[PDB]
From a paper:
In black-grass, upregulation of a phi (F)-class GST1 (AmGSTF1) has been shown to be a functional biomarker of MHR. Recombinant AmGSTF1 has been shown to exhibit both glutathione-S-transferase activity toward xenobiotics, as well as acting as a GPOX, reducing fatty-acid hydroperoxides to less reactive monohydroxy derivatives. The Phi (F) class GSTs, of which AmGSTF1 is an example, are found in all higher plants, being homodimeric enzymes in which each protomer of approximately 23–30 kDa with the catalytic serine residues located at the interface. Each protomer has two distinct domains; the N-terminal domain adopts the typical thioredoxin-fold, with the C-terminal domain being a bundle of at least five helices as demonstrated by the crystal structures of AmGSTF1 presented here.
To explore how AmGSTF1 can be regulated by chemical inhibitors, a series of crystal structures of the native protein was determined. The first two crystal modifications obtained, hexagonal and rhombohedral, diffracted to 1.53 Å and 1.95 Å resolution, respectively. All polypeptide chains adopted virtually identical overall structures, with rmsds ranging from 0.2–0.4 Å on Cα-atoms. In both crystal modifications, the four residues preceding this loop, (Cys120-Leu121-Phe122-Asn123), were found to project into the monomer subunit of a symmetry-related chain, effectively blocking the active site of the adjacent subunit. This arrangement explains why no ligands were found to be bound in either the G- or the H-site of this open-loop apo-structure, with both loops being flexible and presumably closing upon ligand binding.
Author numbering:
A (entry chain AAA), B (entry chain AAA): 3 to 37, 50 to 123, 138 to 218
The structure:
Amino acid sequence: PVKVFGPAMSTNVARVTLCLEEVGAEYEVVNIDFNNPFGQIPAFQDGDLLLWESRAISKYVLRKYKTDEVDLLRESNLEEAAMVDVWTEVDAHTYNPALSPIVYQCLFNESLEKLKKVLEVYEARLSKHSYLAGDFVSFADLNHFPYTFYFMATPHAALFDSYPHVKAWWDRLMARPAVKKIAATMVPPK
Amino acid sequence: PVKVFGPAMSTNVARVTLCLEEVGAEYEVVNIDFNNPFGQIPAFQDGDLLLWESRAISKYVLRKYKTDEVDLLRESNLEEAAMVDVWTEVDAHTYNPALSPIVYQCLFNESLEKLKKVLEVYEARLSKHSYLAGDFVSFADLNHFPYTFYFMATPHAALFDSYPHVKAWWDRLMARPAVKKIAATMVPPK
């Protein structure tokens, strides 16, 4: 059984726990307090192996537990793997940064016009394909879950109704058993 | 022959051209002017395939042209691939951002104390291993080339002399024939 160290509700921990659930790995989430050379969270233990960097942890999980039924990187198919990589990068560089300040300014404390231009592109893409990388769910889709989840707790949630293919894609991810399981974990400690 | 569209000297184009040279692919670099749905540069054509996102382009290049002698992702070995991923992410999230404002404030126009703390970590890592992911060159090392190249044009270049293992690792990358070739291309158009 592998161990994830960090807060359950953080977007970087939820990205790893979502990957562990999609592949059906046995794992434990452990809270750690600061009181792994850059001392980052999440950290990840598998036997003597210690990893950090949410995306590197996630890919290790998706490769280690890969099957014919759950192949979420598609590394056996050059062009599928490329489309998974492209939309993973779009999530990191374009999408998550368009969401982030709406989430932060709405749940604590102009970005709407930039997000709409991004959703136009997603709407075109999800009109031609079931999921971002093609006609199969992949890491690219799962990477969109944690930030969109919090965006859907804001008063801007309904913005997705103007992008019917994006709304349908979002609802489809939200129906996945692994996504429902990780949604329920994304709460402050009790 | 594949085509890379963008400025030769940009860090994101040089990352792709360095990968194409390390695998010995036939390619052409094409300048494009704005006068690929988010219209990003570099863009990449391989037959009917059009890609964007420097890192996704790079990985497609490293997989398409992979051999026994030039395996720069190590996707066949779970833990090696994980260490390549970890240090690729360290480059994106920690290293390149520590260099960037030193490069920008020195060649145009506090970050030194943060860079030193990062170089301490790199020095420890490169004391135990030849290269960042283990005893083999990988994408993780190549990702460090473009920004470090520009950092070495600043008056802070000599900072690496305080980190002898980092200096030796840097000199070793600079001696690679592919790196020398791409260093020479990183000039303004003539």
